[PDB]
Write a protein that binds this ligand. Structure first.
Ligand SMILES: OC[C@H]1O[C@H](O[C@H]2O[C@H](CO)[C@@H](O)[C@H](O)[C@H]2O)[C@H](O)[C@@H](O)[C@@H]1O
Ligand SMILES: [Mg+2]
Length: 244
């Protein structure tokens, strides 16, 4: 029932340039009832909440955390989404396979959850190892996807997950159309967002892998902003003529 469903990643997108973050929030703070806000981050809910306290993030309506593996409503964790992601998911088998790659090192326990297995790629290892991992994981028949970003972060998630799928789920939940949606991102863990039919903005300070993706799949609904960080969101809002 609102005119815009705003979905944005935090670090390097919404966050990173405190001045832009502040004027973006001032602008939005003057028409809060005209849009639904969702932060789609690779951070866990707890970590996202810490960041909010650090930079003064305005309160969103929803939190799509851990790359969309967990969805938080004002009233709490979405148990439907969790059960949906659990179906056919085999965390242990996938972890055993990933653990076997010498070039991969497990990320801290706090970066893991039932639907997210994460690792760090050795800086000296050949990125091609990600292709081998992906193919090996897929051949298990287990519905899994591999998210690679910043040239080092590797997340193993259910195929039904990632930021884009969480976004579409939210869109259906709120009865919001793709033409009324704006997704904002900066890296490989945001590709799922640009895969949806929502309008999208790629920040100027975007990571290599996301720019490469845009070059190959970029369409008319995708906008490459001149501005970096939060400034890219204001620019996109004006570009797509949202909140007219
Ligand atoms: O910007 C916050 C942190 O982002 C990284 O970690 C998050 O995003 C990754 C990509 O999805 C996940 O794999 C990881 O588990 C998340 O915590 C980055 O690597 C950290 O250095 C940043 O502080
Ligand atoms: Mg990102």
């Amino acid at each position: 029932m609102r005119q815009l469903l705003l979905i944005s990643d935090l670090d390097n997108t919404w966050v990173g340039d405190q001045q832009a973050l502040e004027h973006l929030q001032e602008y939005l703070g003057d028409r809060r009832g005209n849009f639904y806000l969702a932060y789609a981050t690779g951070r866990s809910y707890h970590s996202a909440r810490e960041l909010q306290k650090q930079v003064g993030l305005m309160e969103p309506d929803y939190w799509l955390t851990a790359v969309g593996s967990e969805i938080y409503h004002p009233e709490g964790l979405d148990q439907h989404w969790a059960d949906y992601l659990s179906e056919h998911w085999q965390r242990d088998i996938l972890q055993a396979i990933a653990d076997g790659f010498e070039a991969l090192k497990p990320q801290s326990p706090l970066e893991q959850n039932p639907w997210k297995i994460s690792y760090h790629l050795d800086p000296q290892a050949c990125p091609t190892v990600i292709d081998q991992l992906t193919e090996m994981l897929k051949e298990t028949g287990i519905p899994v996807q591999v998210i690679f970003s910043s040239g080092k972060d590797v997340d193993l998630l259910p195929q039904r997950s990632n930021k884009g799928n969480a976004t579409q789920y939210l869109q259906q939940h709120l009865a919001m159309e793709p033409s009324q949606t704006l997704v904002c991102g900066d890296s490989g863990n945001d590709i799922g967002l640009f895969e949806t039919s929502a309008r999208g903005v790629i920040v100027r300070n975007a990571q290599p892998e996301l720019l490469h993706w845009y070059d190959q799949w970029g369409d008319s609904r995708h906008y490459r902003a001149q501005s970096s960080h939060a400034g890219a969101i204001l620019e996109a809002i004006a570009h797509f003529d949202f909140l007219s």
